[PDB]
Design a protein around this ligand. Sequence first.
Ligand code: NAP
Ligand code: NAP
Ligand code: CL
Ligand code: CL
Lengths: 197, 196
Amino acid sequence: GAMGRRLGVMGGTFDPIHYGHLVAASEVADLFDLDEVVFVPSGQPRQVSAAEHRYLMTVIATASNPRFSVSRVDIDRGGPTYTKDTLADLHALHPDSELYFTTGADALASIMSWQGWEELFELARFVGVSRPGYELRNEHITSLLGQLAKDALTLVEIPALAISSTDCRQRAEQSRPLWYLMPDGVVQYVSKRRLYT
Amino acid sequence: GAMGRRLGVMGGTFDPIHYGHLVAASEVADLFDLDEVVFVPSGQPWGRQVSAAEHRYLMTVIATASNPRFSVSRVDIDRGGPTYTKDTLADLHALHPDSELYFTTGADALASIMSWEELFELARFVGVSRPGYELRNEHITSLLGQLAKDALTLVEIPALAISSTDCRQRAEQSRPLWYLMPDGVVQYVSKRRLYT
Ligand SMILES: NC(=O)c1ccc[n+]([C@@H]2O[C@H](COP(=O)([O-])OP(=O)(O)OC[C@H]3O[C@@H](n4cnc5c(N)ncnc54)[C@H](OP(=O)(O)O)[C@@H]3O)[C@@H](O)[C@H]2O)c1
Ligand SMILES: NC(=O)c1ccc[n+]([C@@H]2O[C@H](COP(=O)([O-])OP(=O)(O)OC[C@H]3O[C@@H](n4cnc5c(N)ncnc54)[C@H](OP(=O)(O)O)[C@@H]3O)[C@@H](O)[C@H]2O)c1
Ligand SMILES: [Cl-]
Ligand SMILES: [Cl-]
C-alpha cells in the first residue's frame, strides 16, 4: 500500500462470522493502508463449533472480496492458540509484510497479559476493535494497553460491532432470522448444519 | 400469515438504505408474522438536505431486490408535497385492502408523527431503535404515554447502530461502505457521487 507492504491478521473464533467482523476488517484495512486481511479462525477455545465449520463459514463470508483471505494456521497447528505462533507462522509466509494483528479489544487484553508482550511487538503491530464507548466502559484496560504498547497498539471503535456472534447464536437457537446480519451463504451454513440449535 | 393478513410498511428517507434497515424489517416481519414488507421512501422533507427522491428510490430497489418478501413503493415520492403518514396509509390500504398495516419507522420519527388518534385506527405502529439511542424529552413522554396504554410497540435492533448519517459521513470521508449495505448500494452512492 501507500506505507509499504502491510498485511492484516484478523484473529477470532468466528462462531459465527458476521458483518460486524467484515466491517471491522474493511475499516482497519483502510485505516492502516493494508494490502490484504487474512482471517485466522482460532483453535478450539462455552464449547465453540468444530473448527471446520468456523473455517467454512469464514471462507464463505470472505470469498467475494479480493482483499480478504482465510488461513488454516491456527486450526491446523493442534492445541490451544497462542498469538505468537499465529504471527510466527504468517511472518514465514509473508516475510516482507508488516503484520497488523486485529481482534476484539477484550481479547487483546488477554493476549498481552500473559503471552509475552515484548516478543509480540517484535512480530506485529496490534489493533483492538470494539463497539463505541469501549474506553468509557473499560477506562483502566484502555490506559494499561496504551502504556504497554505506545505507538504499536491502536484501539478502534466500529458501530457495526453492535452485531455480536453471541446474539447471532441466540437468534439461531430461537429460530429468529439471521438475514442481513451476515452473508446469506453463512445464514444457510448455520441453518444447513444445525449449528446453534 | 399465521396471525392474519399483515403487511409491513417501512417508512423512512433511506439516504442511504443500509443493513440496519433491512435487519429491522426482517425482525419486525418475524415478530408480527408479516406476509411482506413494503419499503416507502419518504418525500423530500419540508434546511434539511436529502438526496433527490429517485436516488433514494433506486438505492432501496437495489437493496431489497433479492428478497422475495420485500418490495418498494413510490406512493410518497410520487404524491407531491410533504409526506403525511395518514396519506401513506390511505394509499397502501387502497392497494392492499385485506391487509392489516404495520407501520414501522425509527422510534424518534414515530414520536414526531404523533404531534394521531385517527392514525392509530389505520395501522399498528412499530418503532425500531438502536441500543443506547437518546431521545429528546418531548419524544420520550410521547412514547411513554402510548407504551403505558399498549398502543404501540418498540423494538431494539442492534444492527441499527449502523446509521444513514454515519454512512454519508464515511462516503464524504472516502472511507469504505463495504458490509454496511449491499455492494449495489455502495456502488450507486459512488457512481452517482451522492455525499461529496
Ligand atoms: N494468549 C493468547 O494469545 C490468546 C488468548 C485469547 C485470545 N487470543 C486470540 O484473540 C483472538 C480473538 O479470540 P476470540 O474471538 O475467541 O475472543 P472472544 O473472547 O470470543 O471475543 C472478545 C470480544 O472480541 C470480539 N472479537 C473477537 N475477534 C474479533 C475480530 N477479529 N474482529 C472483531 N471483533 C472480534 C468478540 O465479538 P464476536 O463474538 O462478535 O466475535 C467479543 O466482543 C483470536 O485470534 C484468539 O486466538 C489469544
Ligand atoms: N407528519 C407525518 O406524518 C410525518 C412526520 C415526520 C416523519 N414522518 C414519516 O416518518 C418516517 C421516518 O422519516 P425520516 O426518515 O425522515 O426520519 P428521520 O428523522 O430521518 O429518522 C429518525 C431516526 O429514525 C431512523 N429510521 C428512520 N426510518 C427508519 C426505518 N424504517 N427503520 C429503521 N430506522 C429508521 C433513522 O436512522 P437512519 O438515519 O439510519 O435511517 C434515525 O435514527 C417516514 O415514513 C416519514 O414519512 C411522517
Ligand atoms: Cl415534490
Ligand atoms: Cl391484500
